[PDB]
Design a protein around this ligand. Structure first.
Ligand SMILES: O[C@@H]1[C@@H](O)[C@@H](O)OC[C@H]1O
Ligand SMILES: O[C@@H]1[C@@H](O)[C@@H](O)OC[C@H]1O
Ligand SMILES: O[C@@H]1[C@@H](O)[C@H](O)OC[C@H]1O
Ligand SMILES: O[C@@H]1[C@@H](O)[C@H](O)OC[C@H]1O
Ligand SMILES: O[C@@H]1[C@@H](O)[C@H](O)OC[C@H]1O
Ligand SMILES: O[C@@H]1[C@@H](O)[C@H](O)OC[C@H]1O
Ligand SMILES: O[C@@H]1[C@@H](O)[C@H](O)OC[C@H]1O
Ligand SMILES: O[C@@H]1[C@@H](O)[C@H](O)OC[C@H]1O
Ligand SMILES: O[C@@H]1[C@@H](O)[C@H](O)OC[C@H]1O
Ligand SMILES: O[C@@H]1[C@@H](O)[C@H](O)OC[C@H]1O
Ligand SMILES: O[C@@H]1[C@@H](O)[C@H](O)OC[C@H]1O
Ligand SMILES: [Ca+2]
Ligand SMILES: [Ca+2]
Ligand SMILES: [Ca+2]
Ligand SMILES: [Zn+2]
Ligand SMILES: [Zn+2]
Ligand SMILES: [Zn+2]
Ligand SMILES: [Zn+2]
Ligand SMILES: [Zn+2]
Ligand SMILES: [Zn+2]
Ligand SMILES: [Zn+2]
Length: 316
């Protein structure tokens, strides 16, 4: 919509106050003109028609319970945009400043959130398995990272390539969570999963086995469920990424940690320059080693740590 750029205030799903960029034309709309070709947040009104109505508010104050999923979808899309632009010099998910559109209140009791190829879609959850999923910055950034993947390597969503696709989204979802630096961790979805249970998550990057996911190539799932285990076998790569950043000794292999910024630079370069739609785990290792070589030199600690981490998870 055409209007004045304004700054509203509201509270997100977890009750935290934040400012949001809006546009004023009779109503205040969740339209942020400060980032690329805009960030736009819509109300699906418990239906499945997309995108729905551009979110309109009478007073630029978003403190109602019904407002909270929209506040977070809008604000965390902005954080994700800022991460990719400021850290990787990438303008929106496509690198060409595409508008970021999100719809909240999708369907009823819907325990999922997804990038659908052109926008983000957030269920409100059923209140037991999930609360509204835009409350999780890692979920928001995980799904927007699928769009980055689609516009770069094009990893296919099955078998090893699909597990890499998933892990890439968990890695950058977590790096966005740290970039905000409010309540970061190496878990996925902890803010919105199981409101009645503290200390759990959908999966752990630091210890995938906590939730029964593999932490070594020898433990990879080879069945047909979950598109060949894409959210399961992601644990193998997630563990490697955790080790690259934080270090540790895993199955007797010591890894010298190089920190989060270098992890992100290495994997971003791998994704955008070297991976292809059918890259397997071994090819990801090669891409990460080559990326670290490009950035830091073949004799660098960074290259050595990449190799150690993939060794530790059994990926040669
Ligand atoms: O679905 C509708 C959308 O197309 C637009 O017109 O904004 C209002 C919504 O009701
Ligand atoms: O144009 C392409 C679009 O159709 C989709 O495939 O996502 C990646 C883009 O390069
Ligand atoms: O395109 C944007 C317009 O929609 C808004 O009204 O003001 C800022 C512009 O950049
Ligand atoms: O506690 C939260 C509240 O602060 C917000 O306004 O609406 C959603 C709730 O989860
Ligand atoms: O979605 C609608 C939008 O298209 C229009 O510009 O302003 C009102 C909204 O309901
Ligand atoms: O609208 C109120 C808001 O002004 C305040 O900041 O937090 C409580 C809300 O109910
Ligand atoms: O063969 C693997 C071994 O090399 C490693 O140390 O731990 C897991 C085993 O499956
Ligand atoms: O069965 C597949 C297995 O062969 C591969 O190694 O990892 C992904 C699985 O889907
Ligand atoms: O992946 C690279 C590709 O993007 C470039 O266009 O040609 C050389 C390749 O290494
Ligand atoms: O061609 C190589 C590719 O297969 C690997 O995955 O990434 C690095 C490239 O050198
Ligand atoms: O070759 C390396 C280069 O690619 C990078 O600039 O880091 C230092 C050099 O060792
Ligand atoms: Ca209001
Ligand atoms: Ca997290
Ligand atoms: Ca929980
Ligand atoms: Zn998803
Ligand atoms: Zn995913
Ligand atoms: Zn967290
Ligand atoms: Zn799955
Ligand atoms: Zn998923
Ligand atoms: Zn271990
Ligand atoms: Zn460990």
């Amino acid at each position: 919509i055409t209007g004045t750029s304004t700054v509203g205030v509201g509270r997100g799903v977890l009750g935290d106050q934040k400012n949001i960029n809006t546009t004023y034309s009779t109503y205040y709309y969740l339209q942020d003109n400060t980032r690329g070709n805009g960030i736009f947040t819509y109300d699906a009104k418990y239906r499945t028609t997309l995108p729905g109505s551009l979110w309109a508010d009478a007073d630029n104050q978003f403190f109602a319970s019904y407002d909270a999923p929209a506040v977070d979808a809008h604000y965390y899309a902005g954080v994700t945009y800022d991460y990719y632009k400021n850290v990787h010099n990438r303008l929106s998910y496509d690198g060409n400043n595409a508008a970021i559109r999100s719809s909240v209140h999708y369907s009823q009791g819907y325990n999922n959130a997804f990038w659908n190829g052109s926008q983000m879609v957030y269920g409100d959850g059923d209140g037991q398995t999930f609360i509204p999923l835009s409350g999780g910055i890692d979920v928001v950034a995980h799904e927007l990272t699928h769009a980055v993947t689609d516009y770069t390597a094009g990893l296919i969503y099955q078998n090893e390539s699909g597990a890499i696709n998933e892990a890439i989204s968990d890695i950058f979802g977590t790096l966005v969570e740290f970039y905000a630096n409010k309540n970061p961790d190496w878990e996925i979805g902890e803010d919105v999963y199981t409101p009645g249970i503290s200390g759990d998550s959908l999966r752990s990057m630091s210890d995938p086995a906590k939730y029964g996911d593999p932490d070594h190539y020898s433990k990879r799932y080879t069945g047909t469920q979950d598109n060949g285990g894409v959210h399961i076998n992601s644990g193998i790569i997630n563990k490697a990424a955790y080790l690259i950043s934080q270090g540790g000794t895993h199955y007797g292999v010591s890894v010298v940690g190089i920190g989060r910024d270098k992890l992100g630079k290495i994997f971003y370069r791998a994704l955008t320059q070297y991976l292809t739609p059918t890259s397997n785990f071994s090819q990801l290792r090669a891409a990460a080693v080559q990326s670290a070589t490009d950035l830091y030199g073949s004799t660098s600690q960074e290259v050595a740590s990449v190799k150690q981490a993939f060794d530790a998870v059994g990926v040669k």
